Amino acid sequence: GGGGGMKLFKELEETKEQVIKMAKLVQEAIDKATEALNKQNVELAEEVIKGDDTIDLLEVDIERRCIRMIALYQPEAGDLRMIMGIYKIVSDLERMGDEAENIAERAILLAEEPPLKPYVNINFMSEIVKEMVNDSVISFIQQDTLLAKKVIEKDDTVDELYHQLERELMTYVLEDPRNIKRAMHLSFVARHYERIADHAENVAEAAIYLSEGE
């Protein structure tokens, strides 16, 4: 190799740092989004809606870093794979953040009214999903198949849990159509948790590609 070959190294270990940061900010979104939604708390919602902008540039900035690294250093097979993969996931991660930002909106909408039901399921879902966000992005940065496979296993649960939700609400709507307004908002929410999870699972799918690459 040549002199500045270890530049690509530093540049890449940093870019990775940033992915991890961006994911810290995603879990923070979901966590805030769930509190707001739960305890009918708008300060917590507007917080989450402001903070998404951060996550937005984080996509831009990590993407731009990838191109740079490829343009400047000409990374070999392994690096180039690590990089294009980063390039993919930073998008999924941005989508999770946007999904949470959506739960944040809804929670505002659900605040000008009594809950209509304990949010127990939304909650079990919420908890599984953050675990999924984290574990998925860990298993990527460090080539952990087993951990990626677990994340992929958990998704069938979120799916399964989502369906529980679809049906409980059917019964709420059916017992008093007034309830139609909350039911629906609480439907979306569940759909958003389910989208965040599906995404999580991509990161993991990616993590395998990478790990299978060795």
Single out the residue of 47, 173, 208, 211 in contact with a second copy (rule: CB under 8 A).
Answer: 173
Q: Which of 20, 84, 111, 208 binds a second copy (CB under 8 A)?
A: 84
Decide if residue 109 touches a second copy (CB under 8 A): no
Let me know: does 30 contact 130? Beta carbons within 8 Å: yes
Name which of 70 and 128 has its Cβ closer to a second copy. Answer: 70
Angle between helices 180-212 and 120-141 (to 10 degrees): 20
Does residue 67 bind a second copy (CB under 8 A)?
yes
In 3D, which of 94, 147, 154 has the Cα closest to residue 126? 154
142 binds a second copy (CB under 8 A): no
Whether the CB-CB separation of 124 and 3 falls below 8 Å is answered with no
Residue 184 interacts with a second copy (CB under 8 A): yes or no:
yes
Angle between helices 145-175 and 120-141 (to 10 degrees): 160
Residue 91 near a second copy by CB under 8 A: yes
Query: Is 166 one of the binding residues for a second copy (CB under 8 A)?
Result: yes
- For a second copy, which stretch binds (CB under 8 A), given 13-21, 33-41, 75-83, 109-117? 75-83
Residue 208 interacting with a second copy (CB under 8 A): no
The amino acid occupying position 206 is: A
117 binds a second copy (CB under 8 A): no
Give the C-alpha separation, 117 to 114, whole Å: 8
